[PDB]
Amino acid sequence: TPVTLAKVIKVLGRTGSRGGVTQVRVEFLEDTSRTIVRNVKGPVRENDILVLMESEREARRLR
Amino acid sequence: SLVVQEQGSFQHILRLLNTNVDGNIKIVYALTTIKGVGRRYSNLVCKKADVDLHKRAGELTQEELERIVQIMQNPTHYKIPAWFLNRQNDITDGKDYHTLANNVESKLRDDLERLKKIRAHRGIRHFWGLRVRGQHTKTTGRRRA
Amino acid sequence: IIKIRITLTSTKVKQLENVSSNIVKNAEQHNLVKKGPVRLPTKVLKISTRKTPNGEGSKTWETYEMRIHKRYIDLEAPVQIVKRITQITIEPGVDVEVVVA
Amino acid sequence: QHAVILDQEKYDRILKEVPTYRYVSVSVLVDRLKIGGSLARIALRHLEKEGIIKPISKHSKQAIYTRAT
Amino acid sequence: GRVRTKTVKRASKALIERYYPKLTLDFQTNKRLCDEIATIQSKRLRNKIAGYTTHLMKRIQKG
Amino acid sequence: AVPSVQTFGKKKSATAVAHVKAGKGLIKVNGSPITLVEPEILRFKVYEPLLLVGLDKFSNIDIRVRVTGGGHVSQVYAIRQAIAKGLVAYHQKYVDEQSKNELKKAFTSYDRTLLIADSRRPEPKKFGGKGARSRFQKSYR
Amino acid sequence: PGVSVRDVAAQDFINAYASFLQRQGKLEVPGYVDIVKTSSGNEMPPQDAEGWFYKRAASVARHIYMRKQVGVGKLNKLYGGAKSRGVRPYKHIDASGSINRKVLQALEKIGIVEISPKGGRRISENGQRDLDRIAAQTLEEDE
Amino acid sequence: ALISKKRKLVADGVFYAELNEFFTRELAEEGYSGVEVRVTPTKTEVIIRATRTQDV
Amino acid sequence: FTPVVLATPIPEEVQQAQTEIKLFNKWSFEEVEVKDASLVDYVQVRQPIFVAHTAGRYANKRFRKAQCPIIERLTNSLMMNGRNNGKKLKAVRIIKHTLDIINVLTDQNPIQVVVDAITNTGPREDTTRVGGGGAARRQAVDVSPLRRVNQAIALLTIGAREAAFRNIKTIAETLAEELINAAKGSSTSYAIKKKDELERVAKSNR
RNA sequence: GCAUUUGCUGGUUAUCCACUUCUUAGAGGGACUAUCGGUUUCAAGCCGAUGGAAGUUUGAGGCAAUAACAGGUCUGUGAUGCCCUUAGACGUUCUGGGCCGCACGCGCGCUACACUGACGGAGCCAGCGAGUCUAACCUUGGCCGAGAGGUCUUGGUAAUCUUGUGAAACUCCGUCGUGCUGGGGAUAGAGCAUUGUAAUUAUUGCUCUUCAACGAGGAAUUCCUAGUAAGCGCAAGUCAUCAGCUUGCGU
């Protein structure tokens, strides 16, 4: 289980056709200088920690 | 701490009024497999026959069952009031009878045939196989079966 | 003197309160014990018709209200001054009944 | 299915198995033993008047018992 | 949804341009003044008129 | 002369009235002790005002609470509304006002609406549905 | 220091008082004590067929103690519940009146309640004296 | 008397509406405009609001 | 602890454990802690309560339900499937019975067992739907920390409800069995079987 | 009454005195997004925190444009044009019957498929309302009856009496024990009552007996964002009798 954490730096904005997916930018919390942009399912506020099963996709906005 | 260790006198399925009574359920609700007794008739006849209600049917030694079937076949002699009775001033006698196991389907058949041969409106509806009481038929009652 | 009671009933707040005010003003013009205006709870009489004639349309409902305000004042007075104060304060919309004892 | 009358082969099974039960209750008896449910609700009384299990809460819809020692 | 309308806004500007050295920066003593220098039908409206007057004065004494 | 404060507490239709006078320490609800307020799983709800500030403060006062209206859960929320207000208002009048803030700080920091009754009130029913928001099922063909 | 029935839990008092009434053995339970359903909303007779009547007599006496006066019409609304009428929704149904009237007459004959002005039945001189003695014993049960 | 105020105050309303529809139908040619009743002890009085009183 | 005597007896077991520490029913909010970061500030065990009955307004803002204590968020999720709606006084009894049973099977703090169950049974990588036109493909996304707590309570109470349905074991015991078997990753619980099934679907769709 | 020590719980229709916290209802006060902080062109505003009974336009309604529809209604109207009929009438009235008739398809719903449950005792908590003089309305209390109900009285034209509407879900203790079983109560038999001139094609209520499908419902599809959904009953409308409906109300 190579679980890596991260925490939201800036909430970009909603995406998806129904708008149920929030696009956020996260700082990796082990190395600060790495910032990847991914998208989440539930409700996210500013500065809360996430869990990344694999931190490689850097996904774009859905339609 | 009501633990009792009786082992031998227990009995499985047993016959009363030509009906197989399940032996390992409580006596009041065990009697209710007889067509003609219900949860409240059987309760009263157990009370009148002086049976401990907590007993299974595998208990109840044969004189107690004989007392119980004495109460069922002759209720008015053992102080059961006439408003428990299944037939009151019945149709021909004017007496009070509680109809029991095999007589229930026959006395019902007697009543249906009695009011069929007179060609009363209830009898014709029964013969046709329709809802005999004054209830709608346009939407419900499908699947005659 | 005699124990009297004056009961006021109306559907208009403004036309009733000034009548009770005139009653009490005449009550301490020549002084006597008040047992002043005890306002009973207001009664709302509701009629809920549908909206329409014939039942076409969305099933919309109205409710109409009539509000009954009631007030009673329990006075005691000499027999002479009873008639004049019961006759001066007569106003449309306000129903006044006076119980003798 | 489930036995409703004690038969003195279930009775000794009560005495030598419920001390091994760290959580013991009405549904515990009917699952690991094969007992009648209403017999279990009598058994948990009998296992209390002489201490083999002890009560920690007695609600009419739920009884919770542990081994005494 | 706190947008004042052109009844509250236009009245408050007309009430400042002729009563400037009588109005404070405080709401509680501005609404007491609006009962004297103006005729407003409802209590709910003069609280809205005096509140926007107090808001305008806070940005008059700033500039 | 018999220093006494009366107050009230409310929940949704319920109105408990407290009579806080100086005395020996009986805390009785509807003539019966506080230990008998019986939904019996909310029995601790009448107990927070007796335990947040400590049981010592009640040794010199007498409490007599009567409730009407509401339901079984709504009434239980109404005694505790009246007990809390009945002790902080006793302290405002007959003992030091510095002590009142210390108890008012305790109840407010644990605010289950012990001092301030909540403003949640029923919404009226409308036509075309069986509830305030709920509508009847429409059929479309 | 002196106790009333208001300091006793209701269920624990009614059970303790119902046992006392049966131990005395003088209540004149009716002969119909084992036939009746006790309401028209009920389905089955009371399960405790020997001592369900003593529990009503204990429950009614405490109720009259806590109130000013009640009659057999207030007891029927109190002891009645919802009725299952099958396919149609439930509704409140008052209890049986003959049972409550027989309870009240039994209590008057044992002399624990009495007929009252303004109607109904109030609790008597001996009623307060006797309810409070079992109320005293119920507190001191815990060894 | 011997009538509840709920039925009394409503009956005063329907009495007024019956009077008003009567005078609209009757005094149609005189420019009728309304009525008001003054329920007093000793001869309750009714006022007719019509333009040509010399015709009414 | 110097008990105080007064005209109302207020029994001895009440104030002995509650004047100094405001416990649970009898359970401690001390030494309980969320072992999984990204669930702190969403699992609330920091202000103790006496019973899990708090008539609190948590629905009027977006994130205010996080400040609701998680024990009340489990009693709230028990009043479900229709016949039990608005029956909170039954749900507190179930939870009061559950934490007693949980302590018996495992002698740790039953509050700690609940937090262990929540921290495990929340999904970590979920799947959303991308419509386009036609086949309506799926897309794997992340999941919020709040939704992890929201869904963990959902899966636990659904699993207890379905297990206890046509069964002689009560809802209190099956809730206890589900929480204990989820505190460890036993995969004998409904929620753990669901959680890794949702995660392996997203693994295919990433 | 109990304790006894000065206390606790009660009763006492006006015994008297005092007061208005709770209740009532007139006049008012109260919120203005207030204070602070952050954002934007520095505006209109928005966001967060504090205070506050109240911060979504404070919640919910009422009211509600211009233009229209061949929308519904001539079966609300002594609103109405034209057509028809007008004495064996299509007027009106009276006896009967029908509108309810069942191979079947659809829409709104009620009860369920049970153990978060059913049953039995025990606890005991609302709010909106309605109610009779030349007419029998809401009915307390006593007595009778298993019950439904009967009978003798009483209060009330009502903040006074019904009525604290002692509602139901709910809560506690017990019986059941995974079994279409003590879940469910359709269908049917016999009796006792009540409303009505009249109950058969069961008005309705009750008592005993009869014990059906239904094991969570396919494609589809409805309603709903906080004291809301959902559960739960109660009053009113219709009414002489009939509520599985609606309009509200609280839990």
Side-chain angles (χ1 to χ4, degrees):
Chain A
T1 56
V3 175
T4 62
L5 308 193
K7 46 177 299 308
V8 165
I9 294 300
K10 206 183 79 91
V11 177
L12 304 185
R14 316 294 279 243
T15 186
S17 53
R18 288 91 182 172
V21 172
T22 300
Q23 206 161 242
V24 292
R25 185 186 301 277
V26 288
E27 170 284 344
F28 265 80
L29 183 63
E30 297 99 11
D31 186 74
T32 300
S33 160
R34 295 179 67 250
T35 61
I36 193 162
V37 60
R38 308 177 71 74
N39 50 6
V40 300
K41 183 168 172 63
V44 289
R45 64 210 320 181
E46 193 36 78
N47 294 2
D48 72 3
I49 319 295
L50 276 73
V51 172
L52 280 181
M53 289 268 287
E54 71 76 20
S55 80
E56 294 294 328
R57 286 175 65 194
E58 61 87 20
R60 275 217 72 102
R61 52 182 319 278
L62 304 182
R63 277 141 41 95
Chain B
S1 190
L2 284 76
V3 286
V4 185
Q5 196 56 255
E6 188 60 34
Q7 57 88 30
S9 68
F10 184 80
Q11 180 48 45
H12 299 346
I13 62 170
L14 73 163
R15 292 179 63 86
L16 292 168
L17 269 296
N18 297 295
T19 300
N20 294 277
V21 176
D22 205 338
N24 46 16
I25 62 170
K26 293 277 278 291
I27 192 66
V28 164
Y29 299 86
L31 292 168
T32 60
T33 180
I34 299 165
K35 264 185 45 69
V37 307
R39 304 177 203 174
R40 180 138 147 77
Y41 193 75
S42 73
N43 198 26
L44 180 60
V45 306
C46 288
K47 291 186 186 159
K48 285 305 202 195
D50 186 74
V51 163
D52 174 352
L53 298 187
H54 205 80
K55 285 193 131 202
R56 289 300 193 279
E59 289 86 299
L60 278 300
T61 81
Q62 263 64 70
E63 69 275 16
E64 270 169 345
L65 294 164
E66 182 65 26
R67 270 213 300 277
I68 283 180
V69 300
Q70 273 284 130
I71 303 281
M72 301 215 168
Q73 303 254 220
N74 208 299
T76 56
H77 159 276
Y78 298 104
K79 306 286 285 297
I80 288 183
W83 45 273
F84 268 61
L85 269 292
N86 203 358
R87 297 190 69 87
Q88 303 170 6
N89 292 317
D90 51 357
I91 193 53
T92 52
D93 291 331
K95 300 294 187 291
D96 283 298
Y97 304 147
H98 199 86
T99 314
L100 283 193
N102 225 331
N103 308 74
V104 161
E105 61 206 40
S106 69
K107 198 70 82 165
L108 162 70
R109 193 258 188 190
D110 263 8
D111 272 307
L112 295 182
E113 182 65 26
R114 182 206 96 255
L115 59 85
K116 269 178 183 81
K117 86 166 170 59
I118 191 167
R119 293 182 181 170
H121 181 241
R122 275 176 67 195
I124 317 173
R125 299 282 292 194
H126 271 294
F127 161 73
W128 286 330
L130 289 169
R131 293 285 143 91
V132 65
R133 304 172 173 185
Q135 52 195 354
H136 290 194
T137 301
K138 165 175 193 187
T139 52
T140 49
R142 288 159 160 64
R143 295 318 96 71
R144 312 286 301 279
Chain C
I1 66 150
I2 193 66
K3 179 50 45 193
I4 204 71
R5 186 189 254 181
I6 296 101
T7 287
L8 290 83
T9 306
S10 174
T11 59
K12 303 153 181 62
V13 168
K14 181 182 62 185
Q15 263 84 60
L16 178 68
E17 287 297 345
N18 58 352
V19 167
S20 46
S21 86
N22 302 344
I23 287 294
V24 293
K25 184 202 321 303
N26 290 318
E28 69 265 12
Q29 274 201 250
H30 42 296
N31 47 355
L32 53 88
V33 293
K34 208 70 62 184
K35 298 288 96 176
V38 187
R39 309 144 201 268
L40 301 203
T42 187
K43 311 222 194 80
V44 173
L45 310 187
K46 290 176 190 172
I47 294 293
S48 60
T49 73
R50 169 92 177 276
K51 184 71 77 73
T52 71
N54 54 280
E56 190 259 346
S58 299
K59 276 77 175 174
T60 59
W61 290 76
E62 266 171 343
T63 179
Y64 296 89
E65 296 169 37
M66 184 180 287
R67 305 206 160 112
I68 310 298
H69 312 267
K70 185 167 167 185
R71 276 137 184 73
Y72 72 106
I73 301 165
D74 186 275
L75 282 173
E76 60 87 19
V79 285
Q80 198 272 343
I81 66 166
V82 166
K83 275 80 66 178
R84 45 174 301 275
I85 69 175
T86 51
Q87 75 100 19
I88 50 172
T89 76
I90 301 299
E91 189 160 326
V94 165
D95 171 43
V96 190
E97 72 155 50
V98 173
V99 187
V100 168
Chain D
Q1 271 286 340
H2 285 201
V4 297
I5 301 299
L6 290 165
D7 213 27
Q8 184 44 80
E9 171 275 357
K10 265 282 211 162
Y11 192 15
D12 43 8
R13 274 171 60 51
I14 298 295
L15 277 296
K16 67 182 291 294
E17 293 179 353
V18 300
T20 62
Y21 286 170
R22 76 177 312 196
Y23 172 50
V24 61
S25 172
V26 176
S27 84
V28 176
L29 269 69
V30 298
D31 174 40
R32 289 181 48 129
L33 289 90
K34 298 327 192 83
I35 211 169
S38 161
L39 210 61
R41 278 192 289 104
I42 297 169
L44 278 71
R45 322 284 183 77
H46 181 61
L47 294 174
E48 183 178 1
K49 276 75 176 175
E50 293 82 3
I52 300 95
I53 62 170
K54 54 172 211 303
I56 63 169
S57 83
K58 294 152 51 43
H59 184 54
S60 66
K61 285 307 191 269
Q62 168 67 75
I64 315 187
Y65 283 84
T66 62
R67 65 178 64 88
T69 309
Chain E
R2 307 280 175 172
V3 190
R4 274 81 67 189
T5 188
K6 78 176 53 165
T7 300
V8 178
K9 279 199 214 280
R10 194 205 308 282
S12 164
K13 299 172 193 171
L15 189 148
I16 290 171
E17 70 96 19
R18 71 202 58 180
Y19 279 102
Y20 176 75
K22 297 264 268 190
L23 299 151
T24 62
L25 296 169
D26 177 31
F27 166 76
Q28 287 298 320
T29 183
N30 266 340
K31 72 174 168 66
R32 285 305 205 244
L33 182 59
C34 285
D35 293 338
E36 271 66 0
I37 62 170
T39 294
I40 296 151
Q41 293 314 280
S42 48
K43 194 218 302 206
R44 189 173 189 254
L45 192 50
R46 61 97 172 175
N47 300 292
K48 294 189 181 186
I49 285 180
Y52 191 64
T53 311
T54 305
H55 157 85
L56 270 176
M57 301 215 88
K58 284 169 198 157
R59 55 190 293 260
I60 288 170
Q61 63 104 30
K62 174 152 161 93
Chain F
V2 290
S4 64
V5 181
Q6 49 207 356
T7 186
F8 75 101
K10 291 192 162 190
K11 169 77 157 162
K12 245 179 161 175
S13 173
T15 305
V17 185
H19 287 329
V20 185
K21 82 155 90 179
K24 280 73 176 175
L26 73 164
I27 320 184
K28 286 196 173 295
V29 170
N30 284 107
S32 66
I34 185 155
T35 59
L36 266 69
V37 168
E38 273 187 352
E40 196 269 301
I41 193 66
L42 309 181
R43 181 97 57 97
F44 281 124
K45 308 302 278 215
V46 68
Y47 278 165
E48 293 88 5
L50 271 68
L51 294 158
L52 266 294
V53 298
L55 203 43
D56 291 331
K57 280 89 188 160
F58 296 88
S59 66
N60 50 326
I61 64 190
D62 292 331
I63 308 298
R64 280 178 171 89
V65 188
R66 303 218 93 90
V67 307
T68 61
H72 290 141
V73 190
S74 168
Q75 277 180 353
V76 167
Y77 276 127
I79 297 94
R80 49 181 288 136
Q81 183 62 255
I83 303 293
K85 297 170 53 145
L87 178 63
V88 65
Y90 193 61
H91 283 206
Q92 197 263 359
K93 177 168 264 199
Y94 289 123
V95 307
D96 186 18
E97 191 284 351
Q98 183 62 75
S99 66
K100 147 177 167 285
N101 294 347
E102 190 276 331
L103 282 71
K104 185 177 178 180
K105 184 52 161 23
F107 291 142
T108 288
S109 192
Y110 184 70
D111 201 20
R112 207 199 302 274
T113 70
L114 283 81
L115 298 174
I116 301 299
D118 45 344
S119 51
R120 295 200 287 174
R121 283 289 165 171
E123 209 183 301
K125 190 208 156 190
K126 283 91 180 176
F127 57 91
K130 278 183 76 73
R133 309 292 189 90
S134 173
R135 299 291 87 193
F136 294 142
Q137 167 171 355
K138 63 184 293 174
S139 65
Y140 265 114
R141 59 160 57 85
Chain G
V3 286
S4 67
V5 307
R6 283 201 195 245
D7 317 305
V8 193
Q11 184 186 315
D12 303 338
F13 180 80
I14 280 155
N15 297 339
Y17 193 38
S19 308
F20 174 79
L21 284 178
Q22 184 162 9
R23 284 200 256 98
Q24 293 214 330
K26 73 193 61 43
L27 200 56
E28 66 182 1
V29 304
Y32 72 73
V33 68
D34 62 357
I35 298 170
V36 187
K37 186 183 286 185
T38 74
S39 163
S40 88
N42 285 333
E43 280 182 23
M44 276 291 280
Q47 273 166 8
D48 191 2
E50 298 309 320
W52 74 269
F53 188 83
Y54 296 91
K55 214 158 158 209
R56 290 287 290 267
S59 172
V60 161
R62 172 183 180 270
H63 198 78
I64 297 169
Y65 189 103
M66 287 168 83
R67 275 136 195 85
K68 272 164 214 182
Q69 73 282 326
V70 292
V72 305
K74 294 291 205 270
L75 300 179
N76 297 349
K77 191 173 173 107
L78 173 83
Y79 289 127
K83 175 173 184 95
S84 174
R85 44 209 193 106
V87 71
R88 308 178 281 158
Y90 291 80
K91 83 191 301 282
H92 166 85
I93 281 297
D94 293 8
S96 160
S98 177
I99 295 184
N100 296 347
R101 208 194 328 120
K102 286 305 186 75
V103 164
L104 285 183
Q105 288 149 2
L107 295 182
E108 292 179 50
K109 213 161 300 303
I110 193 66
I112 191 167
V113 304
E114 64 181 9
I115 198 64
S116 166
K118 319 151 95 165
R121 284 172 178 89
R122 80 214 305 199
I123 202 160
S124 66
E125 181 67 26
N126 314 66
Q128 303 204 80
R129 180 186 292 114
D130 213 349
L131 269 295
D132 288 324
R133 286 205 175 125
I134 294 91
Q137 303 184 330
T138 301
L139 271 298
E140 60 192 2
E141 58 96 27
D142 53 305
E143 289 89 9
Chain H
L2 211 61
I3 294 290
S4 78
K5 298 301 165 189
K6 287 192 245 178
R7 296 158 57 207
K8 176 91 164 183
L9 272 296
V10 164
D12 293 18
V14 59
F15 162 75
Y16 164 80
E18 187 161 2
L19 265 190
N20 184 25
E21 193 174 351
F22 176 42
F23 289 142
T24 52
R25 220 166 282 268
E26 180 83 30
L27 315 168
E29 70 272 15
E30 286 91 358
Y32 162 82
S33 303
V35 293
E36 57 258 19
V37 294
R38 310 251 180 87
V39 169
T40 71
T42 73
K43 175 203 61 53
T44 295
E45 64 184 1
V46 169
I47 317 170
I48 304 169
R49 180 67 65 192
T51 75
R52 289 191 300 285
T53 57
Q54 53 84 0
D55 186 0
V56 162
Chain I
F1 68 100
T2 75
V4 62
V5 65
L6 72 165
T8 293
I10 187 161
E12 192 295 311
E13 61 86 20
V14 169
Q15 74 278 59
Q16 65 180 357
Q18 296 175 328
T19 301
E20 57 268 46
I21 189 167
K22 94 203 171 203
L23 293 174
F24 204 88
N25 268 306
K26 292 300 112 173
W27 302 113
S28 177
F29 280 89
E30 299 289 330
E31 62 93 25
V32 65
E33 59 88 20
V34 189
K35 276 144 70 205
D36 190 2
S38 67
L39 273 73
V40 181
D41 192 314
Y42 299 102
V43 171
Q44 208 267 341
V45 289
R46 304 271 61 101
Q47 298 99 35
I49 53 171
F50 278 106
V51 297
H53 200 279
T54 296
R57 331 198 210 184
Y58 299 112
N60 268 313
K61 277 213 72 64
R62 199 184 180 203
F63 282 99
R64 205 187 275 162
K65 79 170 88 168
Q67 295 140 36
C68 186
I70 62 170
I71 312 298
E72 206 191 5
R73 287 176 56 70
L74 275 166
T75 70
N76 277 347
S77 285
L78 274 169
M79 322 185 268
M80 202 95 88
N81 285 114
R83 49 169 182 172
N84 311 315
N85 278 337
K87 280 186 186 175
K88 191 163 210 160
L89 289 197
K90 215 179 296 285
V92 188
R93 274 294 180 194
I94 297 158
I95 280 285
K96 182 179 167 294
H97 291 330
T98 306
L99 306 183
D100 293 27
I101 294 159
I102 279 175
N103 186 40
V104 171
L105 278 75
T106 314
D107 283 326
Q108 43 194 340
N109 203 14
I111 304 298
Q112 181 50 246
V113 189
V114 162
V115 185
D116 291 331
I118 304 293
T119 46
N120 280 332
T121 61
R124 294 182 286 113
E125 181 84 19
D126 202 332
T127 302
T128 191
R129 158 194 187 82
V130 172
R137 214 161 181 61
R138 312 287 297 281
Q139 187 65 254
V141 295
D142 289 16
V143 61
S144 174
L146 179 74
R147 196 179 207 275
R148 286 152 63 91
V149 185
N150 278 7
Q151 206 157 7
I153 307 169
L155 288 173
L156 288 163
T157 58
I158 281 172
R161 175 163 327 118
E162 298 209 302
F165 182 37
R166 278 183 274 229
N167 205 323
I168 191 163
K169 48 205 298 162
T170 77
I171 181 67
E173 309 173 4
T174 66
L175 186 56
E177 293 292 328
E178 177 87 9
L179 287 165
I180 293 161
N181 297 321
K184 63 182 181 292
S186 77
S187 81
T188 56
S189 80
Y190 176 88
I192 290 288
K193 290 173 163 74
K194 277 289 178 295
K195 161 210 160 175
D196 54 8
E197 188 59 46
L198 271 69
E199 283 185 11
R200 83 173 68 249
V201 166
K203 177 172 209 76
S204 77
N205 280 116
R206 66 182 53 165

